[PDB]
From Swiss-Prot, chain A:
The gene is apt. It comes from Thermoanaerobacter pseudethanolicus (strain ATCC 33223 / 39E). The lineage of its organism: Bacteria, Bacillati, Bacillota, Clostridia, Thermoanaerobacterales. It catalyses: AMP + diphosphate = 5-phospho-alpha-D-ribose 1-diphosphate + adenine. It is an enzyme of class 2 (transferase). SUPFAM superfamilies: PRTase-like. This is Adenine phosphoribosyltransferase. It is found in: Cytoplasm.
From Swiss-Prot, chain B:
It is an enzyme of class 2 (transferase). This is Adenine phosphoribosyltransferase. Signal peptide: none annotated. PROSITE patterns: PUR_PYR_PR_TRANSFER. Gene3D superfamilies: 3.40.50.2020. The keyword Glycosyltransferase applies.
């Protein structure tokens, strides 16, 4: 069944750039049952953990993070690219292959003491997630754990995210 | 109680530019009960309607579109800014910005509900409807958490059934 989800993920050569094989998640999303199952297995992988909020980075993160928040009866916080959030924000820099970029969170998104599960579609290098984790901590939040639908085990995302509990459903 | 949701919608002056008042729905999202209630009301408003899929234009549209699709037991299709979708896309230009959808996102004949957070002028939603129809999908209805009634989005979307929970 997870095997079946895995086989439904479309691999696209050289997107966004040559050397990357992109994991296209849209066929999972458009299939009612596959989408439902994906959310259910994410919830299931979080059993036994204590948390108050889900946070996800824009934009593919939202697609699993927001329904999973709904499914778990918790709140949802978007972590966003610069310029998108209207109110006062905090910003955090992360590494790209040959540069840096930033992500932002609203200053009021997480309260001190709140336990947060960070969700995303895929763990690659882990830069966007690292920045998200640090944004949550800057507000007094604690990162309970980090969950992904898929993980690229050749890219050392786990190493970048040292000290965090990392869960992924499908490991490539 | 929807009155409560409305009071959690923060109004931000001068964003994204001077003289524009922005409706910030992030306080609704971060409150577990408010977020749950918003999704349940959106689903309640769609009761008695016939549809196969939910579509939402990126990315604020995802925030309600995906959980709503999950709640209603249907599939979800993202409509996206150009260069974001990996596979073969169809495209649609509007006054100029552009939106794209996967060639295979929607089957011919499939009935689609389009979801977004807020109805303003209706441009991006108009484009989203045209993209769905480009694939031979049929727009059942279009639903928003909020609608700025002073901006004539309904007129721009003439011919579509428009639902909104909160009217400003
Ligand atoms: Cl209405």
């Amino acid at each position: 069944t997870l095997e079946e989800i895995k086989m439904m993920i479309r691999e696209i050569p050289d997107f966004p750039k040559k050397g990357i094989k992109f994991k296209d998640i849209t066929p999972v999303l458009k299939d009612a049952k596959a989408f439902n199952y994906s959310i259910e297995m994410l919830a299931k992988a979080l059993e036994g953990r204590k948390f108050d909020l889900i946070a996800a980075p824009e934009a593919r993160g939202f697609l699993f993070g927001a329904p999973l928040a709904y499914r778990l009866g918790v709140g949802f916080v978007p972590v966003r690219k610069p310029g998108k959030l209207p109110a006062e924000t905090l910003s955090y820099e992360y590494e790209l292959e040959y540069g840096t970029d930033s992500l932002e969170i609203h200053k009021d998104a997480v309260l001190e003491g709140q336990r947060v599960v960070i969700v995303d579609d895929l763990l690659a290098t882990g830069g966007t997630i690292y920045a998200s984790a640090k944004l949550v901590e800057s507000l007094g939040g604690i990162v309970d754990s980090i969950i992904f639908l898929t993980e690229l085990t050749f890219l050392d995302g786990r190493k970048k995210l040292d000290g965090y509990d990392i869960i992924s459903l499908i490991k490539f």
